[PDB]
């Protein structure tokens, strides 16, 4: 006689079931003795909101704007724009070696950084 098709939610079942199931909210702490919840400040997402004073970009764009061709950014294009100029300049100077690749911005390992690209350890 049970409804098999409807979504299983925390509203259904006995008291123990209803309190164990949630709605997808991420936890921000743990329970201690006596069912006392300890909130961790570091676990609460901190909204990094910028100052918008004197910001000239608005929600919409003017219709009298010239159309341009879509060119998605690629790793090659980023390397050419950011890394290639410095490598070309040091090549002409005559002082270029693989040891100095960190100078040009290569990161041998992601460990030890606050924002690690893989595995990604930061929020959108």
């Amino acid at each position: 006689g049970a409804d098999r098709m409807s979504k299983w939610t925390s509203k259904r079942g006995p008291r123990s079931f209803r309190g164990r199931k949630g709605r997808g909210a991420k936890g921000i702490g743990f329970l201690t003795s006596g069912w006392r919840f300890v909130q961790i400040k570091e676990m609460v997402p901190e909204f990094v909101v910028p100052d918008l004073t004197g910001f000239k970009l608005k929600p919409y764009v003017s219709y009298l704007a010239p159309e341009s061709e879509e060119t998605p950014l690629t790793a090659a294009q980023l390397f050419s724009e950011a890394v290639a100029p410095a490598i070309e300049k040091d090549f002409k100077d005559g002082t270029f070696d693989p040891d100095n690749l960190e100078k040009y911005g290569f990161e041998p390992t992601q460990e030890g950084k606050l924002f690690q690209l893989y595995p990604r350890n930061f929020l959108r």
């Binding site: 961790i40 609460v44 997402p45």
Partner: protein
């Protein structure tokens, strides 16, 4: 944020920070008489009352004293022409009380 993985926290680790939040909220007119200082919202299901306090204060600079939330059941009673139940989506309601009179 929603539909994202949260970096796991360990004792002594960095503060968790969100730079571009995808939580969107809508201020709604209360259906019943409410106190003068009370503001009603419909927030995402994954947004906690702690998030809403920091969300309103950080982005809107609204001083919040208290936040209460509840989960409203959306009706699953309606039936389409195929006699298949149509689910009105569930939504979370928040009650925000202003902090300085």
């Amino acid at each position: 944020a929603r539909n994202v993985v949260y970096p796991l926290y360990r004792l002594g680790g960095p503060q968790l920070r969100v730079f571009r939040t995808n939580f969107f909220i809508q201020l709604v007119r209360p259906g019943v008489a409410q106190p003068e200082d009370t503001v009603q919202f419909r927030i995402p299901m994954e947004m906690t009352r702690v998030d809403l306090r920091n969300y309103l204060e950080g982005i809107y600079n609204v001083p919040v004293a208290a936040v209460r939330t509840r989960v409203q059941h959306g009706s699953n009673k309606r039936r389409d022409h195929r006699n298949v139940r149509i689910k009105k989506p569930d939504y979370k309601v928040a009650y925000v009380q202003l902090a300085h009179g």
